[model samples]
Target: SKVVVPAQGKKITLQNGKLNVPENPIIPYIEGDGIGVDVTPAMLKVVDAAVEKAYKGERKISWMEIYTGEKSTQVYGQDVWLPAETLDLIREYRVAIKGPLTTPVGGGIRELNVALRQELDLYICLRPVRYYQGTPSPVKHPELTDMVIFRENSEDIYAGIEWKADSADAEKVIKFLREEMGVKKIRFPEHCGIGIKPCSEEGTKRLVRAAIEYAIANDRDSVTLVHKGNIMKFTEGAFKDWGYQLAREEFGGELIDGGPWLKVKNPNTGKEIVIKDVIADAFLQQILLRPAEYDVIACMNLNGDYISDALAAQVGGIGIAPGANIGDECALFEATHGTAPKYAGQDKVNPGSIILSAEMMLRHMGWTEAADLIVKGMEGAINAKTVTYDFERLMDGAKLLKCSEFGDAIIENM
Candidate 1:
């Protein structure tokens, strides 16, 4: 094995798809590219501090450094952006965290991040958007925009099943569509590229089921299926239909008021948890106007992309947004923002995204106390007006701190 497992640490494994964490778990981490150089160290500091304070140094993380993106290229050779060994370590560890990675230019790899997801079959892109008090926001009531987005990661247009225009494959696909399928609506068919959108019942149900399960576990009031089903009937519409069917079949959801909307009683709390659907366009407007009505949202790939960014802007920007890609056996938490190469190694960009991502990782591992402390620390740091340049420029009278100082501030607050 190329990966040197920490002798002092134990492996984090899965027992029936649930995390079986050890006291000193050897969690794999990818340092990422660009600003990852700055944010990752800060995240590691904050996380280690939180775990130490919460568990009195008894329970801790033995962070094992794994490589991907630009760093992997240097370590494994220029031809290797994502090595098999890196994925192996992540699979072996079962839980991991990463900062934002660089999407390679010119084309050897279309997207390094997406490659990791596909390789692992991490079908659920979990993004929980909530307001942090004292953060600069565009909306009047950012606090009301709390929602957990369960994004379908593996299917739909994001599957990258397109053929380039004027290519042989594109011509073949176009000919098949026009002749074999008897299709007539190809406007300007000359040199036209075709892409396939595949949304299967299995994919749709599993993603929605994860959202419903999360809602029940977290005691949320509703799970809304957001889709542009009216236009994309077979793909997006079937996603909505299959989502509702899964809720009814698995969760005992009942039709509410003789309609499509269903209600399921929470097994733990015995409260009615509403299962509803909203057209993607209307859902966008409602997120600003009536955000309090939606708790957990499940949507197809494209809609999820749009919704997550829009929601992040309402509360604050993606600078503080956290994300996780989860499947049955492995979970990888990561920063929701991009690698700002311009600010790389500057110690100026906000580390909050990765820090909060680690917080999610902690919560996922059943380290509730440590996770709560991270939240408390974050809230306290923001309330005290000590933040990085991103928030500093927007907030009046805010004290600007370097990325490392911001992290230290969080530790101090905790």
Candidate 2:
């Protein structure tokens, strides 16, 4: 199932209950999960401070904390996980930020986060990979890793399509493939399970549209459509096709002539960057041959997970990668990392993931100066070669800084 909310409600108010603004214009929902316990609060504080410093009581994010994890377990019952009422708020508000959520392994009903996404149509997964100063990593060079990944949130094998070998549906599909469809390629047993990949034009276009808008708005160089279209033509190829359509529709030419980046007029930096697209397979070679050449990437969900994690592995680990899931109506930020149940409550982990994620949040909220402060503090620490244990153990003569202590350092430098 699909969770849908009709366009009628009691209309909660922000400033007042009636006269001026529409009934509940702005609402932010957060699900504080495992690593989220450590990350989301840090992000909230940083973003709140940034807005406060920037606007000085002019504009502010009306903060509201929505529970989902431990609190929900206590109140409703363990299995009463995601409430329909919670889903209603997301549909109504249309914008949110969340921390990492835990999904019980194996199959029951896919992940809770996945369910929320499908329910609300939050189709774009924005993962930004950047190297900040003072962060620890297992790789040699950190500065060379900075890119935005636009992941298609719905469809594909992740569309939740499946069949058991012994099931009637399994026999139907197998029989059709072998007899009517005239195929003799499958190697699995007659009772083996099957999964369907469903990628549609609507999903592709909207995903690419989000990526293009982000590229144009942020001055990114290119939007590469990462897909294995060579093998899966219709679904994956549609992603590529829609991606190009977005470039053409947004940029106005055939797009082959479109500049990679929006030209800046600063006398100090007098050059224009360009935007373009690339195939999924060749993109890997491009990463090695000219990592700097490709800036922003748009791809399916699976590829985004692989590419972002792979880049993190090359430059560091999953703990060091920071990401945000964005859509036309709402946006959520997270570490894209595991719960690390063993390390829970210890606080003995790298805080960079959440810290940098907050930096991205501020930028998204138009709190650039504060966002810049966090990044500068982070980069300065990185450049000075003093930071967290994660980085210290990897770099020679590097000193380790605890989570809160690093925040203090960032605030001090700012």
Candidate 3:
């Protein structure tokens, strides 16, 4: 008994299409690899302070420490980077948060990040990027870049249906394609590796549905379905087609100006939220040149990952881009960046990514007041120019504070 696990909190439950979050709901977290040691603790401290101050002990979060990555290997023993029990607990609890994890190179294991999403069927990768005032950014108008990205998490090239070069599976797939499927376009098939890209109607529709519904709920102006369907007709192309179908069939969207784009009247507000499509390359440029035109984006897995980070950079928010991988029932929120092992336990890396990620989780749990405080606190801390090294280096007169100190700054400002 003395060996001990982390203390438990009451689980959150969903019923009647609504989440019932207790004042002290049990939330699970994985302190990830590298700077996870730095940022995770800072995130937790700031969140606890935010919750306590916002509700004055009337409401609180009972955080349970769930294991994953290197932490799991230590606890569960050799080579177990991810344990089935971690997944089970997250499913049981319904929502969890995690820090950046180290993905082994040259083939120990693939990304735990991707593994969690795939295993949980967390089909929507949600990244909401917005500008925090006075954060150093590349763009002149970082404020113009505010959008929510819905990346279909379940399929596409990221599905990991790939085979190694010169492997048996590769040879078999190539043979099947050339002989059985009558597919002749694969160049240099003898030396070629093969992979599957499956973007099913069900996957596309559900992801777009979430994107459209989010736009309606948030009063956003448009949902841009970004894909490279122009070239890859079956998978990415079908993604676009299915998205439009879902919009028209479910939301009563009609043609806009006798064109391809559809406009649907927001049932609640009676304003139109446009349903639109963009080629992936054009989308990249348009987001930079015409950032204000887009509001919400729905795309396949690969594009979403790229766009999320790119958009985060526009607003000087790469260090603070909060994201979530959401399924119908299970959700795991995380920092979008990787484990920079160079800064492990140094308290040098920015904690904003993890902290803002926590902000998103709070909002998901319907704790908007606490979320708002976290946002305000970030804005205040950045404005005060007492920031971590990432921001301090770029910001004029910005005092460089340690990661832990930045957490304290947020609390004081809040």
Candidate 4:
């Protein structure tokens, strides 16, 4: 029930262990936000159905809901969003899953969910973008939408940098810019902006190391570094270099020896595997023109947010994209898009993002049969005319589906 995995510090590492499935794999955690309400139910239903369908009545997942959001807020008023008690619960139960969380609008909530990643050191942000068939999209090429994004979670600008007007940092930065950087163009106190971009060699290398390991383990062709190295040389650029170094130091056999594709039987005759980097802005264009040319991607925090959404829009939209946070040990999956608070209570939105993310979670847990079935069934349903409002709006004659209806359709197929 409990697996102990070594720490990668700010990096990501994959692991091996035994699930030892009981009648069910009891998962302890809570769903989040508004859409989380609908998506969580949809995900659980589909995964449960798939597991049942695959393993008959024998194997199943016993899910227990743990609180972290609205319910928790109601329970613990002034300071109860993320309770220390919840962390202990999570620690007791090694593997868990959750939905999108409502990040409190103001400061001091500790990101509402970021503390979990920080406390747990869940460094790898794994997002898989695959276009299901028959899905309508704005892009002329929807099939090229298949991609898996690995965003380094613990570091980069995601570390949260800020400076408020009239604050001490504001005055300090202004003085430094004026005197040290020799900046003549200045209107004092217009507005103040402060930031922290912590892209350490350890951070960058470990993230890349995770990506490279994924590429090799999954038999992917290449792992590309996405960054704005040209402009933000020290940060993004350093990340690129460090990523390559990780490949060399941790994976020299494939980097230098031209290992077989997927480390299979000498596809290139031991001609050294390929690794490269893309400037952040230029990488966007490459996504449209040469998407198939890429496989796994390693990027910083902000760049990752931009690139994932952009790529999701390209293949389809953020509606169906599945984003996840992974450590060398633990992982959390969710919808790459926002909570869509407007449609929180209403069952009118699409549940594909979270459902698809759960499919990934299943596979991550080595339940491949159930995972593949969900994927195949999802693709099958998409190929059918039935779809939720998001894709339905883009179609000329697409049959619209309700939020929960979409789940029923997908599970029936599975």
Candidate 5:
């Protein structure tokens, strides 16, 4: 196969799992699907401008286009959603960015994003939610809702260990549960499907360890373990227990006044950082009512997925929610929003999500100066009342900028 490589940049490499970013690191980007075309380029333009402005020609990013989703199908072959070479390129580079991807309807594969994360064993899904002043939000005190969510990425029910209803596998599992397991709790055993929720100590601890490390590194106040552990006592409850154990064992945390909660000193700042747990339902309400009570959040796969989106809405909704799927060795940053296929090629949707994700990428690359410029630019644009339809409609007297213009707006603000 004649591999079609985009004409751009020197490939970035990793040294012992650490990113060694060159001034012109060859950063690969997936154009995604649908509105990805609009947002991806916008993010690229803003990032390039920020890097150039920050370094004054000493640094720049060479963005190489890598295919996935429908684009990969066209480039590689029919029905080829994800090519082996695309994954190879990402693994080779060690870090990459992506726009929103369309999940093909009627089950070809579940989701390209999930497949990529699972393939790379990106165990943590990182999302930082903070308000941009004047950005449209649903909450009364959006600024108080700052949070960094560390979501367990590779496990839980997301592992897809399930048998469809009426399937032979489902029948066999039900039979075993009723007979060998001495269980009569199957409400409708004849038609009931089965799905496994596996939350291991290793997976739970690794995710919490990352969260605690992040909280300590960032000088954050607390790490809240959010889960529905009260009911799913084994899986989610075990997650909470394992998380506390990890904190105490690795982070030198001790029980706060002889309780389940643990407190440890941040090695860098020498400040107290509490590790606590909350049931999923109450935790959701508390985030709304007591937005500032939490800092960094650690949770299992499904809980984190829900919490991340919920937190995004409090600040400015998922359109501005940047996310990263990270592992010990590699990281892939991407927009958390879905493919808005109706608005495809219209160049009308907000590109903030992908742009902010790129900002996160810059920080990951140790390009804080560039990343700061992105924040400054975004804050300035929103404060100036220049935004896309999502914000403009909600914000009175706001000027509606097209997706590309918003990128220019952010650059101009920078």
Candidate 6:
């Protein structure tokens, strides 16, 4: 066995799709590549401190180092990018956290991150965008833009169902569409690449179910289905229809205005949760104009990818945005931003993304006290005007701290 479990730590298990976290759980962490070198350690130190402070030595995470990305190649030999044991450990542990990874050049894997999600069947890309006080923001009231996005991760055009341009596979697919399917819409059929967008009922229902369930559990006001059904109809339009159907059938949602929109009573809080739909383009504009009206967003793959990043911009940026890929049995929290290779080992970039991601992981494990401390610490640090270069550059009277120092700042506040 290449990976070793911590002797003092117990493994986390899944029961009926729920996590059973131990007092001393052996949580596996991928150190990541590039700037991961700087942020990973900072995240670890901050999380450990929070857990210690919150539990008073009663609860702790026995972090087990697992290899992947650039670091994996170094440990498991060149060209061995994602090893078998890495996936095995993640599944066995059932919960893990990671930093931003570098997508390998020259293509051994199209994208290691996507591969991990697909392989694990981690279909829900959960990104919660919230504002921290005193953080640099472009929006007039960034605090109004609090929203959780449940992005369908496995299907749609992001499924990588496309054939390369001018290739034999592309030509074969094109011929089939033209000759058999009776489709003559291709203006430039020659040398054209083809991509298939699949939005199946199974995929759509699961994603929406997760979003609705999240709304009920969190006592959120509404769950908005964002789609481009007006143009695409079959794939995107079907996604909207399928979401509404699931809400009515499974959650006992009643029609709102004698039609498409529905309302479900939150079983937890008895609050009426609105289930609504919006065109993807209009929803984009409305987010800026009336963000408070929307709370939980459920959408297909490509739209979710676009919306998540755009919303992140309103509350600072992806530099502090945290994300998680979750299935019924497993969840992996990760940094929403990329590995800035230029800033690798320089300790200049923000560590908030990973630190906050670990916060999500803590909450998922039901360590609410520890998780709250992380939020308080982060809020205190940012409000105190001490942050990494990313925030320091934009804010007035901000103390520019290194990646490591920012972690200390959070601990000090905690």
Local distance difference test, candidate 2: 0.64
335: Cα error in model 6, Å: 0.7
Mark the 10 consecutive residues where model 6 has the least summed lDDT.
101-110
Residue pairs clashing in model 3 are none
lDDT (Cα, tens digit) per residue for candidate 3, span 308-399? 87899888888888989999888999988888998888889999999999999999999999999999999899999999999988978989
- Our tally of clashes for model 2 stands at 13
Question: What C-alpha lDDT does candidate 5 achieve relative to the native structure?
Answer: 0.89
TM-score of each: 0.98, 0.81, 0.97, 0.86, 0.97, 0.98
**Which clashing pairs does model 4 show?**
13-328, 29-66, 124-326, 257-272, 258-271, 258-272, 258-273
TM-score of candidate 3 on Cα atoms, chains taken together:
0.97
Global lDDT scores for all candidate models: 0.91, 0.64, 0.89, 0.73, 0.89, 0.92
Q: Write the per-residue lDDT of candidate 5 for residues 144-184, one digit (tens) a residue.
A: 98899999999999998899899999999888999999898
Of the two candidates 4 and 5, the one with more favorable TM-score, higher being better, is 5
Give the CA lDDT, 0 to 100, for residue 11 in model 4.
Answer: 19
Q: lDDT per residue, candidate 6, 1-414, as tens digits?
A: 667779899999887767888999999999899899999999999999999999999999999989888989888898888899888888899999998887778874778898889888999999999888888988899889889999999999988889988999999999999999989899999978888998899999999999999999999999999999989999999999999999999999999888888999998798999999999999999999999999999999899999999999988866989999998778999987888999999989999999999999999999999999999999999999998898988988988899999999999998
Model 2: lDDT of residue 202: 82
Q: Candidate 1 lDDT, tens digit per residue, 129-242?
A: 999989999989998888999999999988889998999999998999889998899997887888889999999998999999999999999999999889989998999999
Residue 136, model 2: lDDT of 55
Q: Model 2, stretches more than 4 Å misplaced?
A: 1-31, 55-62, 134-141, 255-279, 384-386
RMSD of 6: 1.0
Could you give candidate 4's per-residue lDDT for residues 175-258 as a string of tens digits?
A: 887899987767654476666678898887778877877776666777778888888889888888777766656665333345
lDDT per residue (tens digit) for residues 78-170 in model 2: 775676766666545544566666665543756877777677677887777766644555555666767888888877787788898789999
Error of 3 at 174 (Å): 0.8
Q: Looking at candidate 5, what is the lDDT of residue 388?
A: 96
